[PDB]
Amino acid sequence: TNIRVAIVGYGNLGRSVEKLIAKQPDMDLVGIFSRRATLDTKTPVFDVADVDKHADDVDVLFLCMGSATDIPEQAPKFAQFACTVDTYDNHRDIPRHRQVMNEAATAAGNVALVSTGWDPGMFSINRVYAAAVLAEHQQHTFWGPGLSLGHSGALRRIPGVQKAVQYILPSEDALEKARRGEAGDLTGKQTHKMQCFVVADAADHERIENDIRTMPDYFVGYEVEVNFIDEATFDSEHTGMPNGGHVITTGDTGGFNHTVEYILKLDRNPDFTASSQIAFGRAAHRMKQQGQSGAFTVLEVAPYLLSPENLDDLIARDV
Amino acid sequence: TNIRVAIVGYGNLGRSVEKLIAKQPDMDLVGIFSRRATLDTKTPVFDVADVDKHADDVDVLFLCMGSATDIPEQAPKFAQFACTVDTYDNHRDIPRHRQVMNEAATAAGNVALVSTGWDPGMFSINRVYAAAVLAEHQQHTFWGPGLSLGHSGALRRIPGVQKAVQYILPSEDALEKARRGEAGDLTGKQTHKMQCFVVADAADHERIENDIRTMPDYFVGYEVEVNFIDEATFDSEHTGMPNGGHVITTGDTGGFNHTVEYILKLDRNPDFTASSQIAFGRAAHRMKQQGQSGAFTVLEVAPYLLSPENLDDLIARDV
Numbered sequence: 001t002n003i004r005v006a007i008v009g010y011g012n013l014g015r016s017v018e019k020l021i022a023k024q025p026d027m028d029l030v031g032i033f034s035r036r037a038t039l040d041t042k043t044p045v046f047d048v049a050d051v052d053k054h055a056d057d058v059d060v061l062f063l064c065m066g067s068a069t070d071i072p073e074q075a076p077k078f079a080q081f082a083c084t085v086d087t088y089d090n091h092r093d094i095p096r097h098r099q100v101m102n103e104a105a106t107a108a109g110n111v112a113l114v115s116t117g118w119d120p121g122m123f124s125i126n127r128v129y130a131a132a133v134l135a136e137h138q139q140h141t142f143w144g145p146g147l148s149l150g151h152s153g154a155l156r157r158i159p160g161v162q163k164a165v166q167y168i169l170p171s172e173d174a175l176e177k178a179r180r181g182e183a184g185d186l187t188g189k190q191t192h193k194m195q196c197f198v199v200a201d202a203a204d205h206e207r208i209e210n211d212i213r214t215m216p217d218y219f220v221g222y223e224v225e226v227n228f229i230d231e232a233t234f235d236s237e238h239t240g241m242p243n244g245g246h247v248i249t250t251g252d253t254g255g256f257n258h259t260v261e262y263i264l265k266l267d268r269n270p271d272f273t274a275s276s277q278i279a280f281g282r283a284a285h286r287m288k289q290q291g292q293s294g295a296f297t298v299l300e301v302a303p304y305l306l307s308p309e310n311l312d313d314l315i316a317r318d319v
Numbered sequence: 320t321n322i323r324v325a326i327v328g329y330g331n332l333g334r335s336v337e338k339l340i341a342k343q344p345d346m347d348l349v350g351i352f353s354r355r356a357t358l359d360t361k362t363p364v365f366d367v368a369d370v371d372k373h374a375d376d377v378d379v380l381f382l383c384m385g386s387a388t389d390i391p392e393q394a395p396k397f398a399q400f401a402c403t404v405d406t407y408d409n410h411r412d413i414p415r416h417r418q419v420m421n422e423a424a425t426a427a428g429n430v431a432l433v434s435t436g437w438d439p440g441m442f443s444i445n446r447v448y449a450a451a452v453l454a455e456h457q458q459h460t461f462w463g464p465g466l467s468l469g470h471s472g473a474l475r476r477i478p479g480v481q482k483a484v485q486y487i488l489p490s491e492d493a494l495e496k497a498r499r500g501e502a503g504d505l506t507g508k509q510t511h512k513m514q515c516f517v518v519a520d521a522a523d524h525e526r527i528e529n530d531i532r533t534m535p536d537y538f539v540g541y542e543v544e545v546n547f548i549d550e551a552t553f554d555s556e557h558t559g560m561p562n563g564g565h566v567i568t569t570g571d572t573g574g575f576n577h578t579v580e581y582i583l584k585l586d587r588n589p590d591f592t593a594s595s596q597i598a599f600g601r602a603a604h605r606m607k608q609q610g611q612s613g614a615f616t617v618l619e620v621a622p623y624l625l626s627p628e629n630l631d632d633l634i635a636r637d638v
């Protein structure tokens with residue numbers, strides 16, 4: 001029978017997860033658990049406080065709350081009721097998050113997949129594979145083009161800025177050096193460039209630009225494009241969530257170079273993140289069905305467990 | 320303690336494995352098992368008929384005989400004595416090979432990793448991940464331009480062939496269509512061509528050309544160009560072994576496109592194939608130590624098992 005899934009948290013990721021369940025042959029969406037009473041959806045909405053009343057009805061909880069504080073504090077509680085899958089992206093906290101989720105999931109006999117998505121997630125998997133295969137490798141991850149929320153907020157704090165967004169993009173020159181094994185000395189200020197889009201009165205532009213180009217820690221030292229655009233233009237063309245990146249790994253085998261490159265081009269960040277999250281939710285359920293329990297990163301899941309196809313079918317068609 | 324490894328077969332792949340074991344922090348090369356008495360190496364060379372007398376001294380056997388004929392009949396015998404790792408590349412025969420290897424490895428309590436390399440191997444893994452994540456997807460694989468080790472070994476076993484290599488060349492138009500999501504229907508056979516370069520007495524050309532064009536799995540049904548050249552021409556222009564390829568997956572999440580691309584650029588095909596085979600060798604030994612036995616494709620191995628580093632270190636650094 002189908003895996004019974006529910007969504008905790010109805011933001012962008014939760015909405016992406018919801019709409020993609022319809023594309024799954026083997027999953028049924030039971031409901032959304034939200035801290036808000038009224039959501040613009042026909043999916044049943046339940047109080048997050050009542051997850052315990054649906055625990056027997058839910059095989060996998062997709063955790064779609066914010067990573068900043070909500071995941072660390074809430075996720076261990078949810079693991080007592082189902083398998084859980086999160087996209088927790090605070091890399092420096094992932095070992096602790098895994099340990100705490102492992103205690104809770106083990107005690108409950110469930111499987112928690114932590115830190116799925118694309119980074120952490122697919123990029124994590126590609127970093128490890130390429131580094132494992134290529135002895136004495138060089139490796140770089142590049143992000144974007146995508147919105148930087150920290151750098152965007154830094155732009156708005158500039159006196160005179162009415163609206164603003166900042167994007168980070170890979171430097172094409174640094175990408176090409178990485179492909180050739182010659183990026184070893186590049187700093188973060190040389191691997192990426194930045195694009196600013198700012199709404200501001202023209203009388204303030206000279207000051208705002210100099211504020212931007214000499215703002216420390218956020219913009220000093222980077223290649224920065226500064227675009228002053230109209231509020232009408234801003235509200236209409238910068239509401240999307242494009243993202244992606246590259247993982248490039250090289251290694252030498254005695255006078256011979258090898259280049260591994262993994263590229264993602266995403267029109268909608270939470271749509272791809274949800275796609276990854278859903279696949280690892282299938283994995284988590286199957287792992288529990290096999291008798292496993294505890295918490296796992298994407299490094300600990302064999303690839304076939306993500307697929308809705310039978311393993312024998314994958315072997316005959318895709319290997 | 321280090322994994323004790325040995326190499327069966329001393330062609331291009333076997334030589335690549337040999338030179339790369341020195342790079343591994345956790346492997347020692349015990350020797351080479353060969354059908355030939357005289358190899359140009361200081362590594363201990365043993366008779367392949369005597370592998371049974373080394374069974375307690377060898378944890379992992381790297382199987383580096385030819386795929387076209389040697390692997391199917393010979394590989395299952397070696398699973399009696401150690402974990403094995405092969406790069407068997409006859410996709411239409413991989414389910415059968417896995418099944419017979421699984422019986423042999425299970426009886427012996429060893430782990431057989433079958434069909435490693437880059438295709439099968441890394442490309443198989445990338446096909447499965449991208450197809451599992453992108454629910455509605457288009458996916459195509461492209462190979463080359465470059466020298467194919469399996470096809471080349473197959474040519475050299477044809478009676479009357481003195482020297483031979485095969486190249487595969489992808490349609491760059493089809494690759495561009497794939498990126499735009501417009502290739503959909505095209506197969507590998509429809510988007511590649513094969514070039515053979517063969518040194519043979521002219522009296523043997525008719526028979527050799529027929530053995531090429533009617534060779535199942537490797538050449539039957541492909542667009543194949545056959546070149547009969549002189550030995551001097553071969554020896555100067557056909558020594559390099561570069562290759563590479565692309566796995567391209569596109570998908571839509573409801574009005575938003577995503578592209579996943581995996582790219583290899585290999586200066587020396589057998590060096591990277593060996594790099595992959597070695598990593599899966601590490602994995603097979605570790606799986607055996609965890610209590611597993613039988614035969615597994617690359618789809619069935621958790622990524623962290625390939626790495627020489629501790630899982631905790633990979634999580635903290637790479638996820």
Ligand SMILES: NC(=O)c1ccc[n+]([C@@H]2O[C@H](COP(=O)([O-])OP(=O)(O)OC[C@H]3O[C@@H](n4cnc5c(N)ncnc54)[C@H](OP(=O)(O)O)[C@@H]3O)[C@@H](O)[C@H]2O)c1
Pocket residue numbers: 008009010011012013014033034035036048064065066067068087088089115116117118119120121269270273
């Ligand atoms: N690993 C990766 O590759 C990757 C990539 C992208 C994102 N992520 C993670 O995904 C997480 C969530 O992304 P998101 O874009 O979904 O964040 P979000 O849109 O801010 O949703 C976060 C939470 O805010 C609440 N919320 C949503 N709309 C609200 C409103 N109008 N008023 C009040 N509360 C509201 C929801 O909880 P209730 O329904 O309970 O209110 C939702 O769970 C991020 O924190 C990020 O770490 C991971």
Ligand SMILES: NC(=O)c1ccc[n+]([C@@H]2O[C@H](COP(=O)([O-])OP(=O)(O)OC[C@H]3O[C@@H](n4cnc5c(N)ncnc54)[C@H](OP(=O)(O)O)[C@@H]3O)[C@@H](O)[C@H]2O)c1
Pocket residue numbers: 327328329330331332333352353354355367383384385386387406407408434435436437438439440467468469470471472475588589592
């Ligand atoms: N899966 C992948 O991605 C991938 C990519 C590349 C290659 N491969 C596989 O790798 C396999 C090996 O490629 P290869 O280039 O190593 O094949 P090879 O160079 O033709 O040598 C293959 C076997 O022939 C024997 N041999 C070598 N030199 C010989 C000589 N001068 N006279 C007689 N016998 C000789 C060796 O066994 P003895 O020492 O016992 O004679 C060796 O094991 C290919 O068959 C291919 O299927 C896989």
